[PDB]
Structure 1
């Protein structure tokens, strides 16, 4: 695992994310001024929990498809056995989607991109779990404060998937190998971009896990 190969990998993982990021950062940033009116927020608030569950389930399913696409493009992921790909995707996909959300979140006004415009947490009132939703909003708030770059997201979310301590892996060693190379890649690129400081401010992997389990329950 040499410097040029590690840099090959960094570039490779960032290309994969770019090709699978769902919406361009550029589009998200300039749409920030397109905010749901009071009448539209009320329109979403009036909807049944069952309709909101369906809309959200739809968007979430779509987001996971992009994450699977992302995984398929990661060097070595396809070389893993069929069972380990499932184990990694089942445990990790939703955690990736949660990290990806921070790109669509605006800390200035505490709003997120949903169905063509930005709105705040009150948009999801009909689901009837505001604790879960504010804590998701708080999570996305923390990551926006770091100013997570596209390539940071790519590299961090690669590591969220390729975790060799997910229960049920048949080839633990092959996954550790891949994890380690992605760890070197992540750390090398932080050096290169003078972004070492973000490591200590990342959320603990347990926080990210607990938050997805709570989401899964509802």
Structure 2
């Protein structure tokens, strides 16, 4: 199944769907690189209460996830899977897709990430009380930055992050397997064509993205146990549904 021309057509539609849902164009993020938070602004963030920082981050992550949901809806083959399988793939892979896309907003030269209009270092997030997770995210972004991914590579890699036939709970495993296989052929064909197959051995293990996501769910549990009404009253409904329906409504539109 799937000939060379169909594989190349899949590459183009995956890259197109990603450009339409990339949230911020690469040039927009790169243009802001010398716009860095001052010492006074960093201090201001560290002095914010733990629950105010958690609400702001949950809000920014929710916006990012919304673009990942739209990417999935435009992704060739995804809307043809059943609703249960669409939701199983998004619940397990939306945050993983966000963590990979995040490397585009990371500047390896000074170890800063784009957040609320400017670039700031890891110390900006000290008030969350989850410094091991924040450093793990910055390390992961640094490791992805060393690969120098093109926008097309990001599009193809993130399509495979989401289209994972091994997620527990899939009702039509074969359908997800066939779609994952075509996306993998598209990704490997594009790397072979561009002389970039050397990135394959440098891509992170599947367990690394899973550990970052498990750490996020665990740190959220600790926060929620301490501040339950903050989560109930001020966290985005989509965020709570995924990590603590909205997804069904988002996919139906």
TM-score range, shorter chain: over 0.9
Distance across 1 between alignment mates of 2:148 and 2:217: 27
Distance across 1 between alignment mates of 2:149 and 2:103: 8
Task: Tell me how large the CA RMSD over aligned residues is.
Answer: 0.6
Deviation at 1:193, TM superposition (A): 1.0
Q: TM-score, normalised by structure 1?
A: 0.99
Distance across 2 between alignment mates of 1:82 and 1:146: 35
Distance across 1 between alignment mates of 2:85 and 2:130: 33
Distance across 2 between alignment mates of 1:33 and 1:194: 32
Task: Tell me how many residue pairs correspond in the alignment.
Answer: 218
Deviations 1:21-66 (A, max 9, x none): 0001001111100000000011111101101100000011111110
Distance across 1 between alignment mates of 2:21 and 2:218: 27
Please give the secondary structure, in 1, of the residue aligned with 2:79.
Answer: coil
Please give the secondary structure, in 2, of the residue aligned with 1:217.
Answer: helix
Q: TM-score, normalised by structure 2?
A: 0.85
Distance across 2 between alignment mates of 1:216 and 1:66: 20
Distance across 2 between alignment mates of 1:44 and 1:55: 11
Deviation at 1:201, TM superposition (A): 0.2
Please give the secondary structure, in 2, of the residue aligned with 1:206.
Answer: helix
Deviations 1:162-201 (A, max 9, x none): 1111011110000000000000000000011111110000
Q: List gaps (5 residues or longer) in structure 1.
A: none
Deviations 1:139-159 (A, max 9, x none): 000000110111111101100
Please give the secondary structure, in 2, of the residue aligned with 1:118.
Answer: strand
Deviation at 1:106, TM superposition (A): 0.4
For 2:214, the equivalent position in structure 1 comes to 213
Deviation at 1:132, TM superposition (A): 1.0
